[PDB]
Design a protein around this ligand. Structure first.
Ligand SMILES: Nc1ncnc2c1ncn2[C@@H]1O[C@H](COP(=O)(O)OP(=O)(O)NP(=O)(O)O)[C@@H](O)[C@H]1O
Ligand SMILES: Nc1ncnc2c1ncn2[C@@H]1O[C@H](COP(=O)(O)OP(=O)(O)NP(=O)(O)O)[C@@H](O)[C@H]1O
Ligand SMILES: [Mg+2]
Ligand SMILES: [Mg+2]
Lengths: 222, 225
């Protein structure tokens, strides 16, 4: 008896605002693109860790009907997608622009510094530091984010990028509070639209995931 | 958005077997029913504690054996029209043998202590029901009639309905459409219809919901972290 919250409720309303990635972000993305980094499956944990962070942030707002606090994965073999949705704190428009566009992540500063100071392949250095959210672009043709801040009266947004130069933001209706990230997989990365492949990855660490984690409606952790 | 699992999926398929309560159980029922004990709301925690126990038992069966994990939740629902309050858990459930033995006897240790203390002391039942509790039979503080469905988590298990009006006898019959775990439907006495009010149940449960070890819902609303 399965438990799913992921469905196509969202629709883009009105016009698009166009944004450029920070220079350092473009550099990071290009390095990832042209690296031969083989453990691309890391993007799943990067996104689950972010979902967990967002749910933890939501707790900080609680005092004495509690909000649902869940992380959902869904694979779609036919569409070549993998989706992660959390019911956590979400992002304002300002937050989308800043958080998904810059190199604020402390590990990513360390990463970029390591590129200058280590006589190692980039793949090894990606292994050492990680690249956080941008790990999605290991596997994605295109990344499609919907987010709505848990703050009352906040609007929903769509953030779009193919990971080259530019990202877009538009207002969206039908966005649940929290964040949904839809990864449109590369033609050579379709393995991550398979339930079995994703289960095998996530099983290795689901016991360490602090919130309820579902894969295609099936509960993965205690 | 609400989260509810409680609905009328069950129906009796099997013959009815009628059972007499053990004499000591009859005696405890008798004592509790007639008591001036006024803190009747306790039955709600009694049932939630049992739901929790059942869900904890289900954990003990889990191993890292591949698949999904079972949902582990406790649900309360009130129905003001029908004069009911229902509690459903998705835990270990009860075999037929377990229904007859577990809901039928006074194995419970605090109930043996209760009866001992009532006999060999001069405190009235009011007090010492509060001290000891009377577990599952607390339901008969507030119930005209108690309606239980249960199916054991054990592979192969059938579903059963257990019925009692709390006087002398209980019935059991095989039932279809029982989810693994236990649903308890309390058909409330006339002077007890307050426990079919959501606000009444909420105000009671809020006092201890953050000590409840599993997700707890009231009419589809989450009550605890
Ligand atoms: N699911 C999400 N919900 C809300 N905020 C998000 C989500 N995913 C990413 N973010 C924002 O994007 C930022 C960057 O994410 P990420 O690149 O993983 O770095 P980080 O999580 O800050 N640090 P690290 O612990 O090294 O991953 C986060 O700090 C959040 O502010
Ligand atoms: N929801 C339930 N699911 C499974 N078994 C149940 C359920 N409720 C009651 N039982 C069984 O009925 C027995 C009696 O319950 P109860 O009268 O509360 O005593 P107890 O729970 O054993 N001891 P105490 O800790 O004092 O409540 C339990 O031990 C269970 O075996
Ligand atoms: Mg992160
Ligand atoms: Mg008990």
């Amino acid at each position: 008896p399965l438990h799913s919250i992921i469905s196509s409720t969202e629709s883009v309303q009105g016009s698009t605002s166009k944004h450029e990635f920070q220079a350092e972000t473009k550099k990071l993305l290009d390095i990832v693109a042209r690296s031969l980094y083989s453990e691309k499956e890391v993007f799943i944990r990067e996104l689950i860790s972010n979902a967990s962070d967002a749910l933890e942030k939501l707790r900080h707002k609680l005092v004495s009907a509690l909000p649902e606090m869940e992380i959902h994965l869904q694979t779609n073999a036919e569409k070549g997608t993998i989706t992660i949705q959390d019911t956590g704190i979400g992002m304002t428009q300002e937050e989308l622009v800043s958080n998904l566009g810059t190199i604020a992540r402390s590990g990513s500063k360390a990463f970029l510094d390591a590129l200058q100071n280590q006589a190692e392949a980039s793949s090894k250095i990606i292994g050492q530091f990680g690249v956080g959210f941008y790990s999605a672009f290991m596997v994605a043709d295109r990344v499609e984010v919907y987010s709505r801040s848990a703050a009352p009266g906040s609007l929903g947004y769509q953030w779009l990028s193919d990971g080259s130069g530019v990202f877009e933001i538009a207002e969206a209706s039908g966005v649940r509070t929290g964040t949904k990230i839809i990864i449109h997989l590369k033609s050579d990365c379709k393995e991550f639209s398979s339930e079995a492949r994703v289960r095998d990855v996530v099983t290795k660490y689901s016991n360490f995931v602090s919130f309820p984690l579902y894969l295609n409606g099936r509960r993965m952790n205690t």
